[PDB]
């Protein structure tokens, strides 16, 4: 296995200036002709000319129109085409080839493949080499002239990058289109689509240049009525980049295309963004509420790449976070502005501190700019994306909006049209930092450690107040645990956004303040502090760290009720829950270990329950925030705080805490569930796909959360509400009715009813599969076998496989059954999927990421299955390298 090292970057000895492609799609094969106009670079030392090319069938290859002969002048080993240097010209030359590829059977969904009846490409990161020979790396920038031909009846719509400059008929019922894309681009941004596509379209006029941009959104004909929201989101994205960043689209046309079979969410191919249908298509009758925020974020994400990734691209793949972390940050700014709900930011934090913190304390931990890789297909991690986004967001926190915008423009202007590195972005931010500090000696050299140092910092606090001097001090310490990437961890530049709350009246005691912690520890002192405050720390979650606030639960309750910052309120609640969880967990664990006949559990803090009631009953409070405060922290967040976690004991702990709170608040929950109904389920705009109300959807989230709590509690006659909920027009509601009915004998009646409602829309059926998969059923294993035999079968569609199995893996009691049978089941699915889609097979390994954090019996059971998978003779490169890293082999 070849290991690529970041320190080994060197420019190529060759240049590719022009790519001229002819892609002729036929029934059983696709023939690709390519002429590369090439040159010798200043770095050339007379080496062999080596092209990437994976799985290509060579018809012929030539240099300057002279056919080369296999063996004497080149070798091809199905991975690399080597032309011996004695046959490589010394000046500008043309390399041409004709190869045969087979999209129909390309079930890995990389390169050129068929998704249902659509031919589609996916070239990031190194998939272009599966289409034709290339020096397949992002610093090889070239012009593209692309002709696609195909049967006209099956493939009437042909698309690639650039301007469509010719359309022509071909004998035998065929036709072609030629696309010329003069601006230089890396090959991972190449795309082609052919299909019987239907579309919606609009014209957008840019803010400053007043350019007319044609916007097209495509899907198969069956789902064309689900395209409206995506088009609205694209218009919103363009406006936001214009309004916040001053950036306009510079091309004549932008196409978005939905396909059913896609390894991830979407891809930013220049002018031809290609989407998983589940991240582009929705309608109010056939989609759950989550789809609306999903499409907004994914359309925005791919649009924002046009500057951060496409116009400014990557020198090499180790810079991935430069485009992905920065684009997620841009996406997050956009979504926060569009939704105007505090739960948007809270949802990103919630994901980071569960999924990404788990990754960063696992054997897979890496910095956002890794030092090495074997598989690019495994490189697209929550660390690179979501911790990368938080590192990009900290620049905005440190600089403030005005100077952040100044630094961002410096980055765009300096690097527009070229490749770039993480250092280029830090340099632009540093120029703004010097301006903000009015100090040309200021620098951000320390900030670069956020790119190189792995692991999550821990930040802890101690406080002192002198009542006579009116002087308050915050002593802060930071610590990152050593790991495999750094034996000694250096202190980071950690920005700590803080407020000081007067406990007597809940008011702010200081102006907006961002402490700049740059040492292992520092003490921050404030004068003229008239009373002892409660500190509001890391407002907005201002750094990606473990916060140890060292506050009492009384102080945390005061913040939860009265602080101004949504995150600190949510975090104060989180911390109260965690203290309770760890305490009850240890009490249950000791009772288990000591085989106690009787024991005591510490009850939930009664003032905390009172505060939850206070917030729930406040008609001025936010429904989305309310849904967070009645939910315990995610299991994957909890596990970062417990060694040798016994998942059964944790399940018992959660059950006790939920029952303690429900025994006090269920009547409040039921009253709110009923009173929220009119606004939550308002149908006034049900048939307007342009009208999306994020507050209303949060109201439904709250109702569906409360219904789940009441159903688990067997609240009297709650089954009446469940059955009525099943009649709601909103899929979020009627799919919730299925999941909460798990606790009642009507489950399979609602199983059948919701199946019939879901079965005729491909994406809705996948949402139904997820709902069944996450159902809290004692017979869940039998239910999964029924889904396999009756619905999933041998589908190779990743959306189908992920829907059936991933939600179930979050079933704490059943997936972690002490027999190991859930580990065995998912391992069988992984090995089966690995035969045709190694990238998705590795995604299905996600439940094993926490293996060494569980109790020793479950560690052994998980490790056994991973070793079984590693011993499969046909294991893919992706899955092997992933499992080797995960098992510390
Ligand atoms: O959709 C998402 C969610 C984030 C990953 C968490 N991310 C996508 C994104 O940033 N779009 O801008 C995205 C697009 C292509 C790939 C990709 C990489 C490969 F190497 C492949 F082989 C391949 F087929 C696809 C991975 C992620
Ligand atoms: Mg092949
Ligand atoms: Mg405008
Ligand atoms: Mg996102
Ligand atoms: Mg299908
Ligand atoms: Mg290791
Ligand atoms: Zn992206």
């Amino acid at each position: 296995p070849k290991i690529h090292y970041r320190k080994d970057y060197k420019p190529s000895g060759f240049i590719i200036n022009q790519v001229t492609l002819n892609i002729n799609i036929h029934d059983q094969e696709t023939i690709v002709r390519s002429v590369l106009d090439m040159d010798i670079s200043k770095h050339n030392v007379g080496e062999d000319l080596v092209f990437d090319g994976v799985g290509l069938k060579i018809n012929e290859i030539s240099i300057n129109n002279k056919k080369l002969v296999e063996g004497e002048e080149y070798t091809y080993d199905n991975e690399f085409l080597t032309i011996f240097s004695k046959f490589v010209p010394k000046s500008k030359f043309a390399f041409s080839s004709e190869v045969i590829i087979h999209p129909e059977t390309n079930y890995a969904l990389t390169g050129l493949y068929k998704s249902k009846n659509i031919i589609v490409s996916q070239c990031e990161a190194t998939g272009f080499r599966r289409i034709t020979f290339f020096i397949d790396r992002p610093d090889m920038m070239a012009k593209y002239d692309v002709t696609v031909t195909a049967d006209k009846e099956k493939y009437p719509v042909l698309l690639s990058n650039g301007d469509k400059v010719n359309e022509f008929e071909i004998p035998g019922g065929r036709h072609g289109a030629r696309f010329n894309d003069p601006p230089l681009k890396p090959c991972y941004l190449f795309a082609v689509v052919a299909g019987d596509l239907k579309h919606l379209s609009a014209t957008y006029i840019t803010k400053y240049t007043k350019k007319k941009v044609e916007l097209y959104v495509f899907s198969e004909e069956k789902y064309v009525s689900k395209l409206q929201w995506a088009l609205e989101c694209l218009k919103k994205s363009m406006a936001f980049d214009e309004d916040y960043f001053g950036l306009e689209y510079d091309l004549s046309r932008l196409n978005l295309v939905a396909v059913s079979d896609f390894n991830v969410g979407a891809m930013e191919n220049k002018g031809l963004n290609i989407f998983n249908a589940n991240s582009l298509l929705a309608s109010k009758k056939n989609s759950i509420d989550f789809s609306y925020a999903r499409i907004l974020t994914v359309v925005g994400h791919e649009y924002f790449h046009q500057y951060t990734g496409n116009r400014v691209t990557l020198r090499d793949w180790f810079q991935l976070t430069l485009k992905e972390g920065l684009t997620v940050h841009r996406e997050n700014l956009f979504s926060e502005e569009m939704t105007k709900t505090v739960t948007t930011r809270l949802s990103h934090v919630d994901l980071l501190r569960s999924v990404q913190f788990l990754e960063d304390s696992s054997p897979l931990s890496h910095p956002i700019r890794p030092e090495s890789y074997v598989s690019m297909e495994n490189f697209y991690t929550t660390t690179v994306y979501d911790k990368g986004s938080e590192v990009m967001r900290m620049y905005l926190t440190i600089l403030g909006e005005e100077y952040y915008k100044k630094g961002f423009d410096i980055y765009i202007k300096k690097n527009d049209g070229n490749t770039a590195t993480c250092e280029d972005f830090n340099y632009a931010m540093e120029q703004a930092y010097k301006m903000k500090k009015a100090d040309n000696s200021a620098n951000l050299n320390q900030y670069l450690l956020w790119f190189s140092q792995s692991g999550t910092p821990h930040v802890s606090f101690k406080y002192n107040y002198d009542a006579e001097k009116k002087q308050y001090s915050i002593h802060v310490n930071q610590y990152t645990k050593p790991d495999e990437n750094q034996k000694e961890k250096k202190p980071l530049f950690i920005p700590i956004s803080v407020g000081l709350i007067n406990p007597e009246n809940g008011k702010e005691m200081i102006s907006q303040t961002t402490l700049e912690l740059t040492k292992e520890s520092d003490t921050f002192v404030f004068n003229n502090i008239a009373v002892k405050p409660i500190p509001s720390l890391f407002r907005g979650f201002s750094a990606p760290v473990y916060i140890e606030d060292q506050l009492t639960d009384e102080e945390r309750i005061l913040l939860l009720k009265y602080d101004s910052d949504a995150f600190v309120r949510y975090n104060s609640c989180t911390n109260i829950y965690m203290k309770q969880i760890l305490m009850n967990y240890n009490e249950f664990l000791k009772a288990k270990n000591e085989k106690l006949e009787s024991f005591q559990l510490t009850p939930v803090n009664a003032q905390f329950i009172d505060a939850i009631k206070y917030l729930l009953e406040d008609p001025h409070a936010d429904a989305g925030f309310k849904s967070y405060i009645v939910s315990l922290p995610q299991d994957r967040y909890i596990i970062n705080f417990v060694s040798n976690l016994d998942t059964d004991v944790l399940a018992d702990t959660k059950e006790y805490i939920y029952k303690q709170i429900g025994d006090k608040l269920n009547d409040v929950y039921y009253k709110m569930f009923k009173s929220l109904e009119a606004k939550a389920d308002d149908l006034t705009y049900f048939n307007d796909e342009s009208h999306v109300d994020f507050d209303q959807m949060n109201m439904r989230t709250l109702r569906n959360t409360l219904l789940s709590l009441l159903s688990k509690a067997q609240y009297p006659n709650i089954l009446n509400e469940i059955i009525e909920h099943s009649k709601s027009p909103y899929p979020s509601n009627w799919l919730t009715s299925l999941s909460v009915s798990a606790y009642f004998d009507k489950y399979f009646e609602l199983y059948d009813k919701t199946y019939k409602l879901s079965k005729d829309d491909e994406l809705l059926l996948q949402e139904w599969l997820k709902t069944v998969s996450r159902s809290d059923r004692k017979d869940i294993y039998e239910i999964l076998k029924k889904l396999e035999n009756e619905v999933l079968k041998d589908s190779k569609n990743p959306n189908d496989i992920r829907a059936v199995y991933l939600p179930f893996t979050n079933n704490l009691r059943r997936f972690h059954d002490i027999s190991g049978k859930g580990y065995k089941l998912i391992a069988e699915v992984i090995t089966k999927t690995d035969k045709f889609n190694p990238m998705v097979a590795t995604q299905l390994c996600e439940p094993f990421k926490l293996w060494n954090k569980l109790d020793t019996k479950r560690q052994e059971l998980m490790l056994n299955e991973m070793n079984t998978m590693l011993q499969e003779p046909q294991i893919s490169n992706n899955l092997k390298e992933y499992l080797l890293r995960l098992t510390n082999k």
Side-chain angles (χ1 to χ4, degrees), residues 1-6 8-209 211-249 251-412 414-467 469-486 489-619 621-834 836-879 881-888:
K2 174 77 183 314
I3 306 155
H4 303 272
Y5 289 100
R6 179 175 77 90
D8 284 346
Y9 174 83
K10 281 186 325 226
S12 174
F14 302 97
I15 301 161
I16 299 165
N17 288 319
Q18 177 81 56
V19 183
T20 304
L21 296 184
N22 285 259
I23 299 167
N24 311 125
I25 303 164
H26 293 275
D27 179 60
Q28 287 208 85
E29 65 188 14
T30 287
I31 295 165
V32 180
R33 301 188 292 268
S34 168
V35 178
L36 306 182
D37 294 301
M38 292 185 66
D39 205 350
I40 305 296
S41 81
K42 66 191 211 174
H43 307 101
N44 186 277
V45 295
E47 60 265 44
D48 296 331
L49 172 54
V50 187
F51 291 108
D52 304 293
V54 174
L56 309 176
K57 186 200 312 183
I58 295 174
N59 275 350
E60 63 184 277
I61 65 175
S62 298
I63 286 185
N64 299 326
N65 295 325
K66 177 179 170 41
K67 202 175 192 295
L68 308 187
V69 51
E70 191 278 329
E72 275 178 15
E73 298 161 333
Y74 74 89
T75 60
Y76 181 46
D77 68 0
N78 213 28
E79 181 173 15
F80 303 109
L81 172 66
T82 302
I83 302 162
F84 305 120
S85 70
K86 74 201 289 214
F87 304 117
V88 180
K90 262 79 154 200
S91 57
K92 287 182 172 188
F93 65 99
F95 172 86
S96 50
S97 67
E98 182 179 278
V99 304
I100 303 179
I101 61 183
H102 310 268
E104 169 76 34
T105 54
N106 183 359
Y107 305 124
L109 320 185
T110 57
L112 192 65
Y113 66 100
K114 211 176 164 239
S115 174
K116 207 174 299 193
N117 294 321
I118 299 165
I119 295 271
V120 63
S121 61
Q122 171 57 40
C123 289
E124 195 179 358
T126 55
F128 189 71
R129 66 184 70 174
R130 293 180 169 277
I131 299 180
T132 186
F133 295 110
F134 210 73
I135 299 172
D136 184 357
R137 36 188 283 180
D139 59 343
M140 300 295 299
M141 307 246 282
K143 306 161 76 166
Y144 283 71
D145 185 326
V146 177
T147 298
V148 187
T149 74
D151 180 78
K152 191 174 194 175
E153 200 71 27
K154 284 197 277 240
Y155 303 111
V157 178
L158 306 175
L159 298 162
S160 186
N161 318 90
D163 300 300
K164 186 164 62 172
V165 295
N166 196 30
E167 298 176 290
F168 55 98
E169 301 290 294
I170 301 167
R174 295 176 66 82
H175 72 142
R178 175 187 193 181
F179 290 83
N180 193 206
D181 193 18
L184 295 173
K185 67 168 174 292
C187 64
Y188 79 87
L189 291 174
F190 166 84
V192 64
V193 179
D196 190 6
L197 308 175
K198 308 293 173 184
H199 66 271
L200 302 182
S201 66
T203 302
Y204 188 93
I205 300 175
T206 59
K207 184 173 185 176
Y208 298 112
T209 62
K211 181 184 184 65
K212 273 186 170 54
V213 183
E214 305 301 327
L215 304 186
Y216 279 83
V217 299
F218 294 93
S219 74
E220 63 174 292
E221 172 172 10
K222 183 175 193 283
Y223 297 121
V224 65
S225 73
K226 300 174 73 173
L227 288 163
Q228 294 167 245
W229 177 234
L231 183 55
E232 292 303 309
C233 288
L234 184 53
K235 303 181 173 155
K236 293 170 192 290
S237 303
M238 299 180 71
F240 182 78
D241 229 358
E242 287 176 337
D243 294 343
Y244 192 99
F245 290 103
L247 303 176
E248 303 161 282
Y249 196 69
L251 306 179
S252 298
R253 181 158 159 166
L254 176 48
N255 305 284
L256 315 187
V257 179
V259 299
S260 289
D261 301 88
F262 208 69
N263 286 340
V264 296
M267 175 65 210
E268 72 268 20
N269 322 280
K270 215 150 151 184
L272 179 49
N273 298 350
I274 294 170
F275 295 72
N276 194 318
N278 69 23
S279 298
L280 195 71
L281 307 184
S283 70
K284 287 181 183 172
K285 166 173 182 213
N286 292 308
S287 303
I288 65 165
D289 292 347
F290 181 95
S291 283
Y292 284 88
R294 174 65 176 179
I295 291 159
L296 177 72
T297 64
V298 174
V299 168
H301 184 96
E302 310 310 333
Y303 179 75
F304 298 137
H305 268 307
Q306 176 69 358
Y307 274 89
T308 52
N310 295 359
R311 285 179 63 152
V312 183
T313 193
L314 308 188
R315 189 191 71 176
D316 60 71
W317 287 118
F318 297 95
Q319 321 304 323
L320 181 59
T321 201
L322 174 66
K323 78 177 173 80
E324 297 302 342
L326 184 52
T327 298
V328 176
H329 164 60
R330 282 152 57 59
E331 165 209 339
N332 286 353
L333 290 176
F334 167 65
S335 290
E336 292 177 41
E337 176 73 24
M338 294 298 102
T339 64
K340 292 298 183 180
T341 54
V342 296
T343 58
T344 300
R345 172 70 180 149
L346 296 187
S347 72
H348 183 67
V349 175
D350 207 75
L351 188 145
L352 184 86
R353 300 205 299 183
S354 54
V355 177
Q356 195 279 326
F357 279 16
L358 187 166
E359 182 167 276
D360 251 336
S361 65
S362 82
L364 299 174
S365 174
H366 50 283
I368 65 175
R369 176 159 71 173
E371 297 303 334
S372 65
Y373 64 82
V374 171
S375 156
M376 277 310 298
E377 292 185 350
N378 294 339
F379 205 77
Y380 288 70
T381 62
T382 184
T383 294
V384 162
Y385 274 69
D386 301 307
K387 180 176 171 171
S389 75
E390 296 297 295
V391 171
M392 291 297 181
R393 180 187 187 274
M394 274 186 291
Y395 287 116
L396 169 56
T397 300
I398 290 160
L399 293 168
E401 182 172 296
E402 171 184 350
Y403 281 102
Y404 179 72
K405 285 172 179 182
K406 283 191 171 155
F408 191 92
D409 214 56
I410 289 173
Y411 171 69
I412 295 300
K414 283 205 175 100
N415 302 282
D416 192 11
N418 207 0
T419 62
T421 65
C422 293
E423 282 84 358
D424 290 318
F425 195 83
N426 199 64
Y427 171 84
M429 297 291 110
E430 185 176 86
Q431 302 321 294
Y433 192 64
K434 294 167 171 311
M435 300 194 308
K436 183 195 180 65
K437 294 294 194 178
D439 183 357
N440 284 321
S441 73
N443 68 75
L444 294 178
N445 284 8
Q446 184 183 14
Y447 200 89
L448 289 168
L449 291 169
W450 282 114
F451 289 87
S452 59
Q453 185 175 289
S454 63
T456 312
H458 301 68
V459 180
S460 51
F461 299 85
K462 295 240 173 57
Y463 314 105
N464 182 257
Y465 182 64
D466 188 301
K469 321 163 162 142
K470 319 304 171 195
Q471 192 176 72
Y472 184 68
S473 330
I474 300 175
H475 177 74
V476 193
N477 175 265
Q478 65 167 296
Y479 162 78
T480 300
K481 291 185 192 180
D483 63 17
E484 309 295 342
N485 302 312
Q486 285 95 29
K489 298 280 179 181
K490 292 182 181 196
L492 301 171
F493 189 145
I494 299 177
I496 312 177
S497 296
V498 295
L500 296 180
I501 295 298
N502 182 330
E504 300 310 324
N505 63 8
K507 295 190 183 302
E508 309 286 324
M509 299 180 74
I510 55 169
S511 297
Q512 177 164 43
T513 299
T514 294
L515 313 177
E516 290 179 3
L517 174 66
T518 60
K519 299 189 290 185
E520 160 186 329
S521 65
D522 213 342
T523 291
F524 296 92
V525 189
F526 304 84
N527 281 321
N528 302 318
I529 298 302
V531 299
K532 182 185 179 188
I534 302 166
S536 167
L537 301 164
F538 285 104
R539 290 187 159 177
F541 193 58
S542 69
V545 304
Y546 287 113
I547 303 159
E548 293 155 10
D549 66 16
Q550 233 63 50
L551 300 178
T552 69
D553 280 353
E554 179 171 12
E555 290 171 318
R556 290 169 179 159
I557 290 167
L558 206 147
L559 293 176
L560 174 56
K561 295 176 62 175
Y562 298 120
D563 198 359
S564 57
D565 183 75
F567 167 72
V568 175
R569 298 176 72 201
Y570 154 92
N571 200 42
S572 290
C573 184
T574 300
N575 295 340
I576 297 174
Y577 273 132
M578 283 303 308
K579 176 172 161 81
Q580 182 74 207
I581 288 161
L582 296 181
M583 175 67 71
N584 291 149
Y585 176 92
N586 285 139
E587 291 164 338
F588 273 124
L589 179 69
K590 291 177 90 86
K592 183 177 184 165
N593 286 341
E594 300 170 26
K595 294 232 171 83
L596 298 181
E597 295 298 337
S598 70
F599 62 102
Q600 280 153 84
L601 295 165
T602 302
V604 175
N605 178 309
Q607 283 65 240
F608 175 49
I609 291 174
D610 282 339
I612 293 172
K613 187 182 173 294
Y614 170 96
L615 295 183
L616 291 182
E617 287 179 340
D618 179 3
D622 181 82
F625 186 80
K626 290 178 184 188
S627 75
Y628 276 98
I629 67 172
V630 296
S631 305
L632 267 67
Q634 294 279 313
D635 296 342
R636 280 179 291 195
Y637 178 82
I638 298 169
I639 196 167
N640 287 308
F641 301 94
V642 180
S643 319
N644 296 163
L645 184 123
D646 184 321
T647 51
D648 287 325
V649 171
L650 173 62
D652 289 349
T653 299
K654 292 165 45 178
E655 195 153 357
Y656 170 69
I657 293 162
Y658 273 120
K659 195 63 168 45
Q660 281 260 304
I661 301 172
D663 281 349
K664 293 234 199 114
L665 299 188
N666 279 342
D667 287 339
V668 174
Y669 292 168
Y670 180 78
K671 181 185 173 87
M672 293 172 64
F673 176 82
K674 301 302 280 186
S675 68
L676 287 155
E677 179 176 299
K679 287 175 173 179
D681 294 344
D682 166 44
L683 294 174
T684 298
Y685 298 103
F686 192 82
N687 282 313
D688 189 336
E689 287 287 329
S690 75
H691 182 107
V692 177
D693 186 332
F694 288 95
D695 285 333
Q696 183 181 5
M697 294 191 287
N698 273 342
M699 290 185 258
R700 294 203 283 269
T701 295
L702 181 52
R703 284 193 89 223
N704 286 322
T705 299
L706 296 176
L707 191 51
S708 174
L709 297 168
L710 291 166
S711 301
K712 298 196 200 210
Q714 304 282 282
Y715 193 72
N717 299 113
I718 196 66
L719 185 57
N720 293 334
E721 270 77 25
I722 296 180
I723 289 307
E724 289 307 299
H725 212 53
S726 83
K727 293 164 208 202
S728 174
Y730 284 107
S732 285
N733 293 338
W734 56 254
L735 284 176
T736 293
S737 82
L738 172 61
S739 35
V740 304
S741 76
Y743 309 109
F744 295 89
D745 57 16
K746 295 175 123 85
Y747 179 75
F748 282 120
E749 167 183 300
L750 288 181
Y751 179 108
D752 292 342
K753 158 183 196 152
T754 58
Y755 174 75
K756 292 182 182 178
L757 292 174
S758 307
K759 71 183 197 312
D760 296 311
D761 175 301
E762 159 185 292
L763 295 181
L764 188 53
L765 180 56
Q766 287 158 7
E767 291 308 320
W768 181 84
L769 290 170
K770 298 182 187 178
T771 306
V772 174
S773 176
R774 47 167 162 264
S775 288
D776 189 7
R777 289 291 297 185
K778 306 176 165 179
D779 53 354
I780 189 61
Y781 282 91
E782 294 58 50
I783 290 171
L784 291 176
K785 192 181 308 303
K786 181 181 166 79
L787 292 186
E788 290 169 343
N789 296 333
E790 294 185 5
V791 184
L792 181 63
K793 305 187 196 287
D794 284 333
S795 172
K796 291 178 195 292
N797 180 336
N799 285 358
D800 285 340
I801 301 158
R802 292 184 290 232
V804 168
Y805 292 110
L806 287 183
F808 155 78
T809 68
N810 292 303
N811 186 323
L812 187 64
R813 235 146 203 154
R814 305 283 182 255
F815 170 67
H816 293 286
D817 190 282
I818 200 54
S819 69
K821 70 166 156 185
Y823 310 150
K824 180 189 179 60
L825 170 65
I826 299 302
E828 285 165 358
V829 173
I830 292 157
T831 296
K832 181 187 181 196
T833 306
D834 194 48
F836 63 88
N837 193 326
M839 186 170 183
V840 173
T842 304
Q843 297 172 357
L844 295 165
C845 289
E846 187 175 6
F848 292 103
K849 287 174 83 181
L850 49 58
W851 72 273
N852 65 348
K853 301 174 171 125
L854 302 178
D855 61 87
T856 55
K857 175 80 181 144
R858 288 186 172 90
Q859 289 194 41
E860 174 191 346
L861 293 162
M862 283 199 166
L863 185 56
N864 170 67
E865 295 298 337
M866 288 186 289
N867 282 328
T868 291
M869 286 187 290
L870 275 166
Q871 294 285 277
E872 287 290 351
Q874 303 306 308
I875 185 169
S876 72
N877 299 335
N878 275 358
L879 186 57
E881 77 87 27
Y882 192 81
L883 288 181
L884 284 177
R885 285 188 291 126
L886 181 56
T887 62
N888 278 323

